[PDB]
Amino acid sequence: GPGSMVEQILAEFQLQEEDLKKVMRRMQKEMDRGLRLETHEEASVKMLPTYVRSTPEGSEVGDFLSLDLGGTNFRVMLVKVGEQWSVKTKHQMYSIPEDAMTGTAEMLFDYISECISDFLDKHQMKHKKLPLGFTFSFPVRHEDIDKGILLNWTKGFKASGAEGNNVVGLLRDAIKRRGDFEMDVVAMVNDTVATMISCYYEDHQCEVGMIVGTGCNACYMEEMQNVELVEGDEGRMCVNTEWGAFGDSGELDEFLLEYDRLVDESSANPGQQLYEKLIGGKYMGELVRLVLLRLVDENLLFHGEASEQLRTRGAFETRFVSQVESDTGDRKQIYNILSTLGLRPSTTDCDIVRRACESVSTRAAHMCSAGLAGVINRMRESRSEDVMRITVGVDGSVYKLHPSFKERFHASVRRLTPSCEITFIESEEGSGRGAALVSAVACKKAC
Ligand SMILES: COc1ccc2nc(NC(=O)[C@H](CC3CCCC3)c3ccc(S(=O)(=O)N4CCN(C)CC4)cc3)sc2n1
Ligand SMILES: OC[C@H]1O[C@H](O)[C@H](O)[C@@H](O)[C@@H]1O
Ligand code: NA
């Protein structure tokens, strides 16, 4: 409105502790709703049972394959477990073409199967039939540890014939059509789950997995008596919260800003994954772009004139946000970004662009922290210890590559979780290694 000022505009992103506690308590309410049989179907946070349990008592050595499929690339990993346990891995990255991102799920899996076939050829692992763990970074309703149907794509990925289908069967069918090799798919897990398992290997206190990358989600070990969707009260079972859909029932309405509505309105999945849209690297850069456009329309930035690039959706990558915030103080990192976008920025413009990035990324960290606090505080209600010692495994480009996200996030989480001694583990290739590690236990369990 009238009298607009840079600080006043960027201040809209602030979230006071009372705001974070309110977000946190609402997340806990939605988590309870997704866990109970009565409200599950209408719950925004699905709390999907993963069928990964705490009870198996043994594992085994051997060679295990891992497939890790996200929204743009995928990697194959060969994990060798030997002997105390010794774990050695090899891997290869692949990128899904175009006659895929728009094509059928069958086309997608055929390409993935061709890639796995080539990987095994190159490592002379064709003769031996290997077990494969599958990390699939999308919402899946599991029927067992190796059976789940895709509920819906997220993060703007698409491929017809996938939603409503058993993802494992899709991979199995494709491996079949290739017919030049055998492979047993022994488990399919979400990337949050694989990440928690890869960290659990190194630290058994790890019972929470989290991802802050293209998307944002979390899994944690819940008491079986609380998982109403699976008969039994013995032990714990990992639950994939799919908390990115938090707010999809209106729970965040009072916090949403115009920039958030615009990002949602123009996204590939309007009205869905609203919490994730406040945090995820898929949306962070676009949020900063809308904020910068607002500043120029108010004649507070670039003397009111934006460039063609700046005015096209997706032009401000989250990678750019991270680079802006890494600036040493001389504006070179910032200038390198703006100049490449067709802008002739002043030193002041650069400083304004940095404060805008900080406003958006700080809000992401704070929103994300209320979610994690909600998970950790809930868990603490099932332990008799005064101080709960818990380890959170985390993966994701925002958490790992953004200059100061990690620290803001950690600090905010800690302020909201008294009586909890939290250790954060930044996972290295966990999404992929966790799938292989769970396969060894699943293979041993199946004798
Ligand atoms: C076969 O069908 C089924 C059914 C249920 C099930 N649950 C499983 N659970 C596991 O594999 C559990 C899940 C953990 C999450 C936190 C609590 C325990 C698991 C336990 C231990 C690890 S591990 O410590 O990473 N590790 C893997 C490598 N081997 C050589 C040593 C042990 C990895 C996974 S496998 C399985 N298979
Ligand atoms: O990859 C991070 C996350 O992205 C989205 O939120 C997906 O829906 C979820 O499954 C995943 O875990
Ligand atoms: Na149960």
DSSP string computed for 216-264:
EEEEEEEEGGG-TTSS--SSEEEEE--GGGTTTTSTTTTT--HHHHHHH
The answer for residues whose C-beta is within 8 angstroms of residue 273's C-beta and 6 or more apart is 154, 155, 215, 244, 245, 248
CA-wise closest residue to 240 among 135, 162, 364: 135
Give me ligand 3 centre to Cα 191, in Å: 23
List gaps in the chain by the residue before each (C–N > 2.5 Å): 83
Q: Residue 321 in contact with residue 362, Cβ under 8 Å?
A: no
Three-point CA angle 434, 221, 370, nearest 5°: 100
What are the backbone angles phi and psi of residue 142, rounded to the nearest 5°?
-85, 145
Q: Residue 245 in contact with residue 221, Cβ under 8 Å?
A: no
Cα separation of 406 and 426, whole Å?
A: 10
445 secondary structure, DSSP code: H
CA-wise closest residue to 277 among 299, 292, 295, 262: 262
Cα separation of 269 and 271, whole Å?
A: 6
Beta pairing, strands 420-426 & 388-395: parallel
Q: Which ligand is nearest to the CA of 399?
A: 2
Q: What is the token pair recorded at 370?
A: 């209320």
Specify the resolution in Å. 2.0
Candidate from 441, 444, 445, 447 with most ligand 1 atoms within 8 A of CB, to mutate: 441
CA-wise closest residue to 176 among 217, 224, 227, 116: 116
Q: Residue 247 in contact with residue 274, Cβ under 8 Å?
A: yes
The answer for residues whose C-beta is within 8 angstroms of residue 353's C-beta and 6 or more apart is 292, 301, 324, 334, 337, 338, 345
Burial class (CB in 10 A: 0-12, 13-18, 19+), 150: buried
Q: What is the CA radius of gyration of the chain?
A: 22
Number of H helices, E strands in the chain: 14, 13
Residue tagged 């997220």 (tokens): 154
Of all helices (H) and strands (E), which one includes residue 90? Answer: strand 86-95
Of all helices (H) and strands (E), which one includes residue 74? Answer: strand 73-82
Q: Residue 400 in contact with residue 426, Cβ under 8 Å?
A: yes
**Around Cβ 8, how many Cβ atoms within 10 Å?**
11
Kindly name the residue from 46, 68, 110, 155 that is annotated as catalytic: 155
CA separation, residue 431 to residues 182, 258, 260, 394, 427 (Å)? 23, 34, 29, 10, 8
Is 129 a known active-site residue? Answer: no
Q: Residue 274 in contact with residue 248, Cβ under 8 Å?
A: yes
Cα separation of 421 and 135, whole Å?
A: 29
Of all helices (H) and strands (E), which one includes residue 394? Answer: strand 388-395
Q: What is the largest CA-CA distance in the chain?
A: 73
Is 330 a known active-site residue? Answer: no
Give me ligand 1 centre to Cα 91, in Å: 21
The answer for residues whose C-beta is within 8 angstroms of residue 365's C-beta and 6 or more apart is 405, 408, 409, 412
The residue ranges of DSSP E strands in 96-215, in sequence order, are 130-136, 140-144, 147-150, 183-189, 206-212
Structural determination approach: X-ray
What are the backbone angles phi and psi of residue 311, rounded to the nearest 5°?
-90, 10
Cα separation of 59 and 39, whole Å?
A: 37
Helix (H, G, I), strand (E, B) or coil at 103: coil
Amino acid identity for residue 388 in this structure: M
Beta pairing, strands 62-69 & 86-95: unpaired
160 secondary structure, DSSP code: B
**DSSP secondary structure string, 306-340?**
--TTTTSTT-S-HHHHHHHTT--SSSHHHHHHHHT
Beta pairing, strands 216-223 & 73-82: unpaired
Kindly name the residue from 191, 248, 264, 327 that is annotated as catalytic: 191
CA separation, residue 115 to residues 77, 173, 340 (Å)? 12, 15, 35
Question: Is residue 436 lining ligand 1, measured as CB closer than 6 Å?
Answer: no
The answer for residues whose C-beta is within 8 angstroms of residue 331's C-beta and 6 or more apart is 347, 350, 351
Question: Is residue 442 lining ligand 1, measured as CB closer than 6 Å?
Answer: yes
Distance between terminal CA atoms of the chain?
Answer: 68
* Burial annotation 414-423 (CB, 10 A radius, 16+ → b, else e): bebbeebebe
Q: What is the token pair recorded at 85?
A: 């346990």
Question: Is residue 183 lining ligand 1, measured as CB closer than 6 Å?
Answer: no
Q: What is the token pair recorded at 349?
A: 């413009």
Three-point CA angle 24, 29, 31, nearest 5°: 95
Cα separation of 314 and 11, whole Å?
A: 24
**Around Cβ 274, how many Cβ atoms within 10 Å?**
27
Candidate from 50, 137, 193 with most ligand 2 atoms within 8 A of CB, to mutate: 137
Q: Residue 351 in contact with residue 331, Cβ under 8 Å?
A: yes
100 secondary structure, DSSP code: H
Domains and their CATH numbers in the chain: 1-49+202-428 (3.40.367.20), 50-201+429-441 (3.30.420.40)
Q: Residue 263 in contact with residue 290, Cβ under 8 Å?
A: yes
Three-point CA angle 324, 333, 402, nearest 5°: 40
Question: Is residue 438 lining ligand 1, measured as CB closer than 6 Å?
Answer: yes
Helix (H, G, I), strand (E, B) or coil at 421: strand
Beta pairing, strands 86-95 & 73-82: antiparallel
Three-point CA angle 189, 190, 192, nearest 5°: 120
Question: Is residue 405 lining ligand 1, measured as CB closer than 6 Å?
Answer: no
Q: Which residues line ligand 2 (CB under 6 A)?
A: 137-139, 154-155, 190-192, 211, 213, 215-217, 242, 244, 276
